[PDB]
Nucleic acid binder design. Structure first.
Ligand code: ZN
Lengths: 243, 227, 282, 49, 109, 56, 48, 93, 97, 227
RNA sequence: UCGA
């Protein structure tokens, strides 16, 4: 089978950041950049400070320069690139990018100004400098100007983007998914057989039982212990009642 | 006043559109919505299905071919084929390539109402003695329909492939401060259209504005109510 | 959205009349939110400039691109003279329109301090008790929706330079660097034995960890209050002081597998990076 | 279940020094280990998704 | 050696949802015996304690409860999910056991 | 046999669904909140959607 | 100690072969596993 | 949530009593197939479907909306369980 | 292990000046006990820091900026990896690939 | 397919409009243009400046009157009027108040073609022997123009006021995925609209979409310049 | 022996 990436499939980077696929969004609406090139993923920053993995931040930072400069990078463990060097790479990359911009018969977007204003007020970029130097000082920081594809008005603040190496993990929904109504039962006791293989139903744990007792749902727990599990005529007469 | 509208054309691929002046911030209000409809509903082709006499599936290897089946199919949907006939919903392309030659888009069998904008697109390399017979089937449609979603049933070994219609490669719109206008703080809208050449940037913007106006005219008389 | 911006640009400029400040904002001599004093009253450029007779006018003026949600202005809200930010009014409005009556809403919400983890929790409880279950449910989902979309529009990102190291890092580290040579001198002078020297060094690296942590928090509050890391920590989104400390200031002295604390501290942060030693020992 | 595939990287003819790569491997691009793909990430909360 | 006021979280955890065992008099207001203490009530007893009027709060407890094989409303008090006096038939032993069981994953520091 | 799943059955399913809710459980079950009743909503994908608030 | 090879990718097997386990016959069991075996000794370094 | 749940919780001492009420009443509504209902045409809970808008087949919801009016009656040992089913299955098929 | 425990091993990140030691403060240890050691007393140095980590762990760029937990998780996850048809080599890699 | 349009309103102020169903991605495409236009467009009311007797500064208080000058200005901002003819885009209103009184927008002296649609609005409270005379200036603009962006003094010492032009107070749209048969991918687009009462949400919205297609028709006549 |  050819399995194409689905909704709810495991994904990760080398830096230990996991997650599944939540609602693949249409290419139409994407937080793109001035060139009109949409972003492929859009991860959530929240997981970053807790995990304390800044390797993904630096991978993104290097990738941001790599997308433009068109060259990969080699950074060995505990030997390699530093902030000044990376910032230099981003400086060169920006110097070429903005060059293609002004060279294609364009200039600073009004939305870019809209972001640069508040970026200047919060002290992210040095005031008094032209929007060239401001968007430059913003660029090497890893942050750039992003336009929301849904609306078309930019985001009120800059957003770090770039090339991150991301891995598609083993676990997939096509496999891990399962469910059952009626089917196989153990020979010893009339309980079903847990797992996708035997095509059985889930097991209700002792603590799940405890939870049900805590809610005080009598017939729910009663059904769990009898009607849908090991009861001889329970599941039968039930099935007939529903039918 | 009356906004000046200009169009800077390059080939069937690149295009530029400058509409100025406009109200403050009003450039986005127009420019982005068109971008969405442009990047979504523009009709296109990117083939449909393929067949080879030596091939039972997207895997099985063809003698004298470096690229496997789905490896070629990777480059099959990347082929732009323009239909000159507005009434043509279907076609079939034929390819015969033998010996030590590198095939391509321009190596197919030319037919009426069809042309390829990138003959330099590399299909598969063929070594000495390697012989290949290929036939495809191309249909026109809208958006992106996965191979799994569409059936073919051309014959016993028919292989459906993904379809990216969307003749526009990318759209980038940007607003600036236009010198035109009685007042300041106005916007010059520059919309940049990048397409494959199945449809020119101008035509793309045309049918885009058409879909836009159409869907805009769905606003006719609603059924009222007052809680 | 509820966070109120304050710039030190203007820095308490006292004038005779509103006109001086009026022109002062134009000349760029005073910030929009700068805490100045006009006439005899303490106010800001924003508190004067933007004056609204109702929320709708405020939201229109702001969303038309003439203002920011975090700027301090004057507004008439429910027969009041309240001087606050459009984001605050927006908050109260969301809660009120979610519950269906903004009287009890604006009654039970704090209109002063920025909304966060704690305050929001208190709001949810107070809602569930004063209002009732269904109302609190729809309220919760409203907070979810609006809050989510606000987080989206904010475009809060994490770069390396959002981790910015306190300038007093180098200082406080080199001072302790001399202090080590001090304690060691004591050890060699016979004043300190092995164990007491050890203890002195331990409390030294501990107090240095304190110096740099305090340095981190102060560097955030004084300089970059709008920093995403600091905001995530304060608001209660993600992170704790120690995590940020290890991501900004020093990661702190480690612990030997024997169960006893180590000798040499790890020094450099995660945004700095650790040598082979510091990582292994960690 | 993961497929093992070796993609020939060599042209119909050319010189090859000893140790030089000819085919490929499932995780191999040109002789460099490739697990996933390099994509464009944007760090930002998006609609609570 | 300075007797200090237990932080309001502790006093909440103690007095919230509790029922008065006997009448209480503080600050001119009076708490009737059998009144279920809400957050407001607990905070008031905090105010009165800061005023130094009440150093102890009489409360009906599961310990003191004479309900055979279980507890009773007036001894238990509020059902913590619904913020009202506990429903009869509610098994509070299981709920309690789970409530203690949940934090069991984090204790190190 | 033959999963056609005609639209008729997609709608009929909802005809027996709406108004009834199914329990969702997350292991480990420690708090009783580890099991909560949720209204089934027929949706594409093989993944199960859960509300972000109760995820805590 | 002898079980299904990891073919999930070349590096999967490549690492799988280089792993060191204190479990299995002749080794220890989870019931007896203490912080001594779980800890990284000062002499681990470039060995493990 | 279920509309009127606060009121319903307020209608009885123990929430479990409410649950029992709703359960038994929904059961009764299933037995006679909604023909025993205390609800008028505008009161009938209706589910909207592409085919057509009909009365919501879910009996539980029907019981909820029913007791919401309070036109029903409940209590311990209200009437003999004997005649309870004799004149029940009688009045309605 | 014992052999190593005898001598004093410097670090691969030490100030190599072109085959000689540069600064008079050299990072070195004994038995696993980090110490600042003069260019005299140093009898040994490790080849590359890479030796301190396994394959998958060594395949993580900017490893010094990630917590031990998440690094562990990533390196452990590289085993869970599955082949992709179009799969591409990482932009920033340790070069051990 | 064929999107159905529905409208549920109340009064001349509140209105709500739903396009059910719609193609995926389109709801958001429609939402912003209508929103951005409605707030930045749709000409109307908003008195520009105000003159007051015995009052020069916008600050110094007015004796005999309860509320100070500021509060009065603010109450004047909430006032809404309407012109019966396009010929008059600007006019002036008069108010002379004496003795103890409650001064409303009804107490406001009328004008030729000007019809005040805000019959009862508290403006100023007059105490014993309260002396007040004021002249307000009303112009027809669009969007929102601050008192800063336009200075106006007709009388000796006048007070330029924030002009709140667009009768639309607050919009807001939303889009959700509705279910139809097999496909759940649809777009339900709901838009809520508040107005001052001068124009009903129907008129404001229809005018906005008119402005929209009007702006879209501006792509007609390209001028070819090749790069 | 992995997933959470
Ligand atoms: Zn008791």
């Amino acid at each position: 089978q050819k399995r194409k990436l689905q909704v709810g499939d495991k994904l990760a980077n080398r830096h230990g950041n996991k997650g599944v696929v939540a609602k693949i969004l249409p290419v139409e609406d994407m937080p793109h950049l001035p060139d009109g090139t949409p972003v492929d993923v859009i991860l959530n920053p929240l997981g970053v400070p807790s995990r304390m993995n800044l390797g993904q931040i630096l991978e993104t930072h290097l990738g941001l320069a790599g997308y433009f400069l068109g060259q990969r990078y080699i950074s060995p463990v505990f030997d390699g690139a530093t902030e000044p060097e990376i910032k230099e790479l981003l400086a060169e990359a920006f110097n070429l990018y903005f060059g293609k911009r002004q060279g294609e018969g364009f200039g600073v977007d009004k939305r870019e100004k809209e972001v640069l204003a508040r970026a200047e007020k919060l002290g992210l970029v040095s005031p008094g400098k032209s929007p060239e130097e401001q968007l430059k000082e913003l660029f090497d920081l890893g942050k750039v100007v992003l336009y929301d594809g849904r609306t078309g008005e930019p985001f009120e603040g800059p957003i770090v983007v770039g090339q991150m190496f991301i891995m598609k993990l083993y676990h997939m929904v096509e496999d891990k998914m399962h469910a059952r109504s009626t089917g196989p039962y153990s020979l010893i006791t009339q309980q079903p057989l847990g797992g996708k293989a035997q095509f059985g139903g889930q097991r209700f744990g002792e603590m799940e039982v405890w939870a049900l007792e805590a809610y005080g749902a009598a017939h729910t727990l009663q059904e769990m212990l009898t009607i849908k599990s090991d009861d001889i005529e329970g599941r039968n007469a039930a099935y007939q009642a529903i039918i | 006043k009356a906004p000046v509208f200009t169009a800077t054309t390059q080939g069937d691929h690149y295009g530029e559109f400058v509409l100025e002046p406009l109200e403050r911030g009003f450039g986005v209000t127009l420019g982005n919505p068109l971008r969405r409809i442009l990047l979504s509903s523009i009709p296109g082709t990117a083939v449909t299905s393929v067949y080879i006499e030596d091939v039972l599936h997207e895997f099985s290897t063809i003698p004298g071919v470096k690229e496997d089946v789905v490896e070629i199919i990777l480059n099959l949907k990347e082929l732009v084929v323009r239909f000159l006939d507005p009434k043509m919903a279907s076609t079939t392309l034929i390819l015969r390539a033998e010996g030590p030659k590198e095939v391509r888009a321009g190596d197919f069998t030319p037919s009426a109402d069809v042309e390829i904008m990138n003959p330099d697109l590399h299909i598969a390399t063929l070594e000495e003695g390697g012989k290949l017979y290929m036939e495809v089937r191309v249909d026109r449609g809208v958006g992106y329909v996965p191979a799994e979603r569409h059936g073919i049933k051309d014959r016993i070994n028919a292989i459906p492939v993904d379809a990216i219609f969307s003749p526009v490669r990318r759209v980038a719109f940007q607003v600036e401060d236009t010198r035109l206008g009685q007042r300041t703080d106005l916007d010059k809208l520059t919309l940049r259209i990048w397409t494959d050449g199945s449809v020119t940037p101008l035509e793309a913007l045309n049918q885009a504005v058409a879909i836009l106006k159409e869907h805009l005219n769905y606003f006719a008389n609603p059924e009222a109510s007052l809680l | 959205i509820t966070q109120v911006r304050k710039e030190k640009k203007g820095a308490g400029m006292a004038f005779a009349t509103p006109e001086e400040a009026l022109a002062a904002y134009e000349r760029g001599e005073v910030a929009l939110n700068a805490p100045i004093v006009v006439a005899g009253r303490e106010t800001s450029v924003g508190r004067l400039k933007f004056v609204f007779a109702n929320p709708d006018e405020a939201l229109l003026a702001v969303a038309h691109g003439l203002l920011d949600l975090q700027d301090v202005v004057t507004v008439r809200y429910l027969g009041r003279r309240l001087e606050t930010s459009p984001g605050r009014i927006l908050f109260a409005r969301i809660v009120g329109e979610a519950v269906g009556d903004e009287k009890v809403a604006q009654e039970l919400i704090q209109m002063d301090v920025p909304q966060e983890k704690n305050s929001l929790k208190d709001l949810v409880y107070q809602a569930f008790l004063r209002l009732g279950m269904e109302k609190t449910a729809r309220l919760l989902d409203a907070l979810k929706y609006y809050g989510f979309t606000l987080s989206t529009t904010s475009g809060i990102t994490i770069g390396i330079d959002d981790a910015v190291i306190p300038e007093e890092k180098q200082r406080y580290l080199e001072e302790a660097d001399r202090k080590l040579r001090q304690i060691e001198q004591a050890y060699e002078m016979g004043f300190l034995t092995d164990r007491e020297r050890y203890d002195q060094v331990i409390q030294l690296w501990t107090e240095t960890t304190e110096k740099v942590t305090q340095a981190v928090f102060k560097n955030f509050e004084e300089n970059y209050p709008f920093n995403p890391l600091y905001v995530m920590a304060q608001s209660g989104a993600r992170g704790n002081p120690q995590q940020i400390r290890q991501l900004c200031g020093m990661r702190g002295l480690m612990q030997k597998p024997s169960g006893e604390t180590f000798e040499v501290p790890v020094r450099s942060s995660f945004r700095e990076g650790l040598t082979v030693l510091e990582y292994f020992i960690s | 279940g993961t497929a093992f595939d070796q993609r020939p990287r060599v042209r119909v003819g050319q010189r090859v020094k000893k140790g030089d790569l000819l085919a490929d491997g499932p995780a191999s691009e040109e002789g460099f280990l490739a697990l996933g793909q390099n994509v464009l990430v944007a760090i930002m909360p998006f609609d609570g998704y | 050696r300075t007797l200090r006021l237990r932080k309001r979280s502790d006093i909440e955890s103690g007095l919230y949802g509790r029922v008065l065992a006997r009448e209480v008099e503080a600050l001119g207001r009076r708490l009737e015996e059998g009144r279920y203490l809400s957050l407001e009530d607990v905070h008031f007893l905090i105010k009165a304690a800061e005023a130094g009027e009440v150093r102890e709060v009489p409360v009906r407890s599961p310990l003191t409860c004479q309900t055979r094989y279980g507890v009773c409303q007036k001894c238990y008090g509020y059902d913590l999910s619904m913020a009202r006096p506990v429903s009869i038939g509610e098994a509070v032993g299981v709920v309690a056991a789970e409530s203690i069981g949940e934090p069991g994953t984090q204790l190190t520091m | 046999r033959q999963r056609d799943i005609k639209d008729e059955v997609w709608d009929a399913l909802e005809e027996v669904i709406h108004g009834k809710v199914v329990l969702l459980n997350r292991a480990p079950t420690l708090h009783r909140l580890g099991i909560q009743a949720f209204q089934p909503v027929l949706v594409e994908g093989q993944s199960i959607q859960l509300h972000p608030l109760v995820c805590e | 100690l002898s079980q299904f090879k990891d073919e999930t990718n070349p590096l999967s097997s490549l690492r799988h072969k280089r792993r060191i386990s204190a479990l299995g016959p002749g080794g220890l069991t989870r019931e007896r596993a203490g912080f001594d075996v779980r800890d990284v000794h000062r002499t681990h370094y470039g060995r493990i | 949530a279920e509309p009127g749940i606060d009121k319903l919780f307020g209608m009885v001492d123990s929430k479990y009593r409410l649950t029992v009420v709703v359960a038994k009443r929904a059961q009764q509504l299933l037995r006679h197939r909604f023909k025993n209902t205390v609800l008028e045409p505008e009161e009938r809970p209706k589910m909207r479907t592409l085919e057509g808008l009909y009365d919501d087949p879910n009996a539980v919801t029907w019981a909820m909306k029913e007791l919401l009016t309070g036109r029903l009656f409940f209590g311990e040992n209200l009437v003999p369980e004997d005649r309870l089913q004799k004149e029940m299955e009688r009045l309605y098929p | 292990a014992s052999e190593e425990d005898r001598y004093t091993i410097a670090q691969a990140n030490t100030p190599l000046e072109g085959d000689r030691i540069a600064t008079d403060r050299v990072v070195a240890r004994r038995r696993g006990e980090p110490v600042i050691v003069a260019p005299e007393e140093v009898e040994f140095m490790d080849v590359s820091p890479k030796q301190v980590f396994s394959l998958n762990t060594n395949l993580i760029p900017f490893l010094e900026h990630d917590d031990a937990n998440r690094a562990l998780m990533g390196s452990n996850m590289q085993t869970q990896a599955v082949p992709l048809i179009r799969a591409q080599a990482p932009v920033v890699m340790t070069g051990l690939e």
